[PDB]
């Protein structure tokens, strides 16, 4: 077949890319394919992945920057790896009888071999099913795909997905945690502690893990279990801020439990991401806008993250009968886009929005969403109405380089202060004032008088996150065009130390680090006192 000539095409195309590089002249890529594709008799332009595939070692090293496919996987600062666990029943079906109304799929649903809330057809689902829910295989597959695309996986970030992660026995959970840490590091451990200790000295650094949970399985014991695992971020389903809704939907808990979980998690040192759920089947539009104004105004709900989710009706669920019988009529697309525009206008300047729309395919959804591009339509309507969206997901350096073209020219130190679920927090950042471009951030806090961890008692200020945005520069590398190794972290630590020892009036500064980042803090002057990095400031 001419496809055999196709690899000659690559065999020619590579022969060009290095050749010009030998004499150091940049060569255009689209037109070189076009030219050395009509001479060998091709009927399809080459795909970049096959070009990246067959390259000699040093030539791969020198042509990765000019042959990077989808330059957003490393434009945020980490490498996302999504894994799931075994199908299991949610832990409020015993004393209630039925799981939440709107949940699609699950172990006892009509979708065969379906994880809870993740029916059968999201990409992570086919990634995990063929591995039969084996963490080793899944993480290796994701890493090898990310290396196929031509990215650097030197900094990894795990996300466990599925149902709830606490309704499982101890053996299965520790099996997951050790397998993940060993897969990233290369060891073969027996318990969690050995896995963590070898992961600490590993080369491919780990940054942390994110777990989803219900607020009723978020207590002191569970927080201890997380802090042993190395987790550094937690997500709680906070559907609706109204008590009537959270009882009429068989949610199984109350808002007060959610507020208490917020208090405990933020006092311990985590970062919490809420799952709000517009268009619940009793609420309405003005009620939505009021509940979101309350959620971003009440100093008992202010998170450091958000993940919106418009309602979708799916067969074999509680909402399906209500829709069929003549209740819970949906929203028209225009008013939905208007509403989403209003929320994104209300979003505060320190909350990062991750996801706006569900990944559910068109044939599955019976009603509720037409275009799987709601964020861009919402932003267009913002620029239509004159209002502005000013979160950090649309102001970090990486995003506003692929979008637009401008780059920071003058950097300044902005500081914000707040009142969280009962603690006093600060927010330091280096960013461009005149252009609204963010670079790096920090999150201090003064622990309240309801802490339950021994290390944080007696005059302790905690740091929950450090993150400098840009492009993923591997460890010990130095590049003068990216931003991740220019020296902002040292200045942020200096100012955080000054704040914690002069304004907070504290005695200990503690950092909830990951595992691969631990060595980093050892060059600052910190120590280890458990799952924390402490330092005497006096």
């Amino acid at each position: 077949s001419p496809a055999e000539l196709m690899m000659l095409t690559i065999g020619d195309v590579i022969k060009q890319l290095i050749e010009a590089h030998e004499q150091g002249k940049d060569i255009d890529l689209n037109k070189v394919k076009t030219k050395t594709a009509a001479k060998y008799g091709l009927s399809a332009q080459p795909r970049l992945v096959d070009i990246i595939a067959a390259v000699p070692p040093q030539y791969r090293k020198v042509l990765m920057p000019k042959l990077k496919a989808k330059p957003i996987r490393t434009a945020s600062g980490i490498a996302v790896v999504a894994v799931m666990c075994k199908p299991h029943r949610c832990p409020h079906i015993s004393f209630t009888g039925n799981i939440c109304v709107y949940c699609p799929g699950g172990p006892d649903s009509d979708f065969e071999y379906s994880t809870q809330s993740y029916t059968g057809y999201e990409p992570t689902s086919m990634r995990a099913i063929r591995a039969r829910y084996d963490p080793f295989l899944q993480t290796r597959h994701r890493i090898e795909q990310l290396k196929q695309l031509g990215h650097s996986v030197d900094k990894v970030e795990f996300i466990v997905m599925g149902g709830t992660f606490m309704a499982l026995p101890e053996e299965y959970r520790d099996y997951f945690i050790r397998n993940l840490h060993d897969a990233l590091s290369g060891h073969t451990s027996n318990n969690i502690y050995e896995a963590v200790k070898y992961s600490e000295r590993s080369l491919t650094k780990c940054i942390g893990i994110t777990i989803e949970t219900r607020p009723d399985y978020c207590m002191k014991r569970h927080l201890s279990d997380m802090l042993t695992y190395g987790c550094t971020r937690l997500e709680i389903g906070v559907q609706s801020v109204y008590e009537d809704v959270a009882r009429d939907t068989n949610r199984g808990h109350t808002v007060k439990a959610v507020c208490e979980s917020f208090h405990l998690a933020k006092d311990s040192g985590f970062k919490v991401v809420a799952h709000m759920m517009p268009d619940l089947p009793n609420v309405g539009l003005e009620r939505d806008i009021e509940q979101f104004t309350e959620f971003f105004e009440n100093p008992a709900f202010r998170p450091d993250g958000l993940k919106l989710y418009p309602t979708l009706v799916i067969r074999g669920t509680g909402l399906y009968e209500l829709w069929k019988s003549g209740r819970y009529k949906s929203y028209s697309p225009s008013d939905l886009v208007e509403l989403v525009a209003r929320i994104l206008a209300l979003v505060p300047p320190w909350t990062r929005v991750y996801r706006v729309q569900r990944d559910i395919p068109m044939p599955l959804v019976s009603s509720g969403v037409e275009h799987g591009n709601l964020r861009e339509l919402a932003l267009a309507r913002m620029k239509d109405l004159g209002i502005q969206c000013r979160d950090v997901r649309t102001r970090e350096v990486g995003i506003q380089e692929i979008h637009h073209k401008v780059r920071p020219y003058q950097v300044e130190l902005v500081r914000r202060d707040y009142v969280a679920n009962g603690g006093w927090e600060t927010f330091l950042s280096y960013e461009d004032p005149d252009q609204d471009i963010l670079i790096g951030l920090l999150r201090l806090r003064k622990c309240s008088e309801e802490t339950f961890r021994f290390e944080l008692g007696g005059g302790v200020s905690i740091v929950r996150e450090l993150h400098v945005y840009g492009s993923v520069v591997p460890v010990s590398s130095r590049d003068p065009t990216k931003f991740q190794h220019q020296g902002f972290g040292m200045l942020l630590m200096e100012e955080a130390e000054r704040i914690a020892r002069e304004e907070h009036g504290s005695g200990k500064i503690a950092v909830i680090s990951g595992v691969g980042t631990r060595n980093y803090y050892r060059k600052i002057g910190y120590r280890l006192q458990g799952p924390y990095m402490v330092k005497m400031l006096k």
Partner: protein, 741 residues
Amino acid sequence: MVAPVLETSHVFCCPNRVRGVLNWSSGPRGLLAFGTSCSVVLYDPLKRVVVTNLNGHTARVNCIQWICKQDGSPSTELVSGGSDNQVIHWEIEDNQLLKAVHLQGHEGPVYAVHAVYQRRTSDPALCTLIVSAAADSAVRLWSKKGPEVMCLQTLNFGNGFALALCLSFLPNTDVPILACGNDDCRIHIFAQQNDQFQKVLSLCGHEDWIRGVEWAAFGRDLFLASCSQDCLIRIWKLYIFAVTLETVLAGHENWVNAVHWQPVFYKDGVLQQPVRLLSASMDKTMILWAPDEESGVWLEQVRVGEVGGNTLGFYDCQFNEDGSMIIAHAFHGALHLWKQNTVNPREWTPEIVISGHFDGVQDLVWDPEGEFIITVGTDQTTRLFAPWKRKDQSQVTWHEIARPQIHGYDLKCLAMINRFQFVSGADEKVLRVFSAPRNFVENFCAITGQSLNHVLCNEPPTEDHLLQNTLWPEVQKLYGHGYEIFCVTCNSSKTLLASACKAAKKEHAAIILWNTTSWKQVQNLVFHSLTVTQMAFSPNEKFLLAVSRDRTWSLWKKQDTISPEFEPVFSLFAFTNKITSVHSRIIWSCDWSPDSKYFFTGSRDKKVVVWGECDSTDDCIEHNIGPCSSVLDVGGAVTAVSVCPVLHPSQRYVVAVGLECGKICLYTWKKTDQVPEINDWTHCVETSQSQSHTLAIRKLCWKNCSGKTEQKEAEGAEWLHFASCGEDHTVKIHRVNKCAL
């Protein structure tokens, strides 16, 4: 003799998960040594039958290394390791465990061991030198100066670790040398001077963890294989004593896990000194590097590799005594071997090896005719073991020939329905039933030698035919149970099936009966309050029992049938409350004597109660059911009880009682027919540390050879063959002499 003997016939197992657990001794008829669960297994590839086992460890075994004989004789000593923080030295002779020394003092599981016969001139009889690197951020140096052991030295690598070690001797002398790599992307050389190991030099090599080092003394020169993790092998040299860097040969694309020089060998008196190199990596390939004939630069020779499914590469590989074969240990647990084709050295052909589940085997079923066994375990796999004929030759071998299910759930139970039918209780709410294709029966005819027309009533495969080209088709699917299945058992008539599921209330702890022909629920029997742990049907096919976690049982007797086509009904004839119960804790086993009127029970209270008395079947008017004789106290939590399916002259009732630790014990019982209820039980034969497991025992199923109703052809009619479905990955089959009448 008067006291019958117990012997273990067959063992099936495989290496565990860990890197470095493999070795061949350098000598004729060298013995392969690997590690399964918490034991070391010696097996000869040529015999294709396991040699023996060397128990004594407690945790998972990590690394095993032989100690070669300098002359070239088969090795004697065998240094081991484990995750129980102790290093065990072994001494073998005539395939029997001679000596075992428990060296201890490690605060952390060991990962690297290396030793060699030291050659001091002050008549140091069998003076060795053991080195062990563990998870204690330190390495220890030992010595077995005869029948005594003492720790020589301890070196701590700060908060780092140690990953590879080897000992050798400097040229023109006998000064010890030690190559110790670490996670510091670096290897160190320590030479023993004065009387303490010192620091000599610090090489700057790769940029990843070193997953192996190896010395090679050729002529008067030293060559150091320095395998790495960043796809880079690096050969060094050491000459009179500075070290120099040499060829940096590469060609792998993933982590490279092992490297081993081909060892010297004696061919017709003259020793041979080959210069080659074998390695394995995650990339699912093996590269055999040899230098060019004219130029000294190293080049690839062969690219032997495995293509099955989408599994990963290999953790270890071993070459041979001289050059004949090659073995590699896969990821999921597998052994791939290849011998060099005489016509083409670059050509290599597969062979036959052993296998087994890589997790605890939960259940086992013997074939009704008695020629294959089906085993199911937590490894989410079902394996069928059958014999083979090695042409006109003795020592018939049983080994894997099929793999009906590679299902993705955690299977827990098993049941036969017919000659080729299959029911598996997974970790879901559905019972899945299987049938057999014609390829299986055709291959079974081709292998076992039984005629095709006879098997249908008118070489064994390798890793490729089983993992990819073997799957028994599913025929139906049974719903109805609201929770995961926990106990499955059929009846001897292959008509009624019974199932039980995990439960926490009375409604969920109800057993369900199904018809074989029309697969619909015959009846639902409700009793107890927790999950029914064990169940089986009566040999005369009119009783039932449901000993469960609630420390009770059930006696669901059969009711008379008026209409022939009507499905039979069951009624509760006897029961037991907390007061009537004699067991102190959870019950986990049951079996009936094949006398239709007595049965056994086994709990976790270390007591075996033989309460039967289910006689006078025709005139069973009231309940006269209770304890039958004295309660035996073996001394451990009994997990499985079974009764041999044949009766014996002096009213003998022989039972194979297991325990928590593998302690398969044969007991013999008879009612005293008098108010003295002592000495009714007698003890026949125990099991030693060579015929027993190292972990739990799950099912001691016997062999009921219904094909041999009468002993047609026998070698004396004195043997009984039974199974031990253990938890330490072993499916060992035992043979026991019974009697002589």
